[PDB]
């Protein structure tokens, strides 16, 4: 629907939005993985002890 010179602007907007979504998802996953690692360490200690 648009010529390249202007469509680049829209594509850049979409790229920024989707990249931000990915970064948010990855940060959430990192924090959740920290929680799960704490829980798994507790579980391993409970098993051993």
């Amino acid at each position: 629907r648009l010529d390249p010179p202007e469509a680049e602007v829209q594509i850049d907007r979409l790229i920024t939005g989707r990249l931000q979504s990915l970064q948010t998802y990855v940060t959430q996953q990192l924090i959740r993985a920290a929680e799960i690692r704490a829980s798994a360490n507790l579980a391993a200690t409970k098993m051993s002890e």
Binding site: D3, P4, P5, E8
Partner: protein, 48 residues
């Protein structure tokens, strides 16, 4: 080169039109300067 007076604006980078599409296309990331000036009295002929 020499082109129509009203087609000068058609020469800018990332443009559309007969000239840009067919005979002289500038790249979107063109770097440089475009200089134009009427040459009616020096080029146009009384007889055409």
């Amino acid at each position: 080169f020499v082109i129509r007076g009203d087609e000068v604006r058609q020469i800018a980078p990332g443009q559309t039109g007969k000239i840009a599409d067919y005979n002289y296309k500038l790249p979107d990331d063109f770097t440089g300067c475009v200089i134009a000036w009427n040459s009616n009295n020096l080029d146009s002929k009384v007889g055409g």
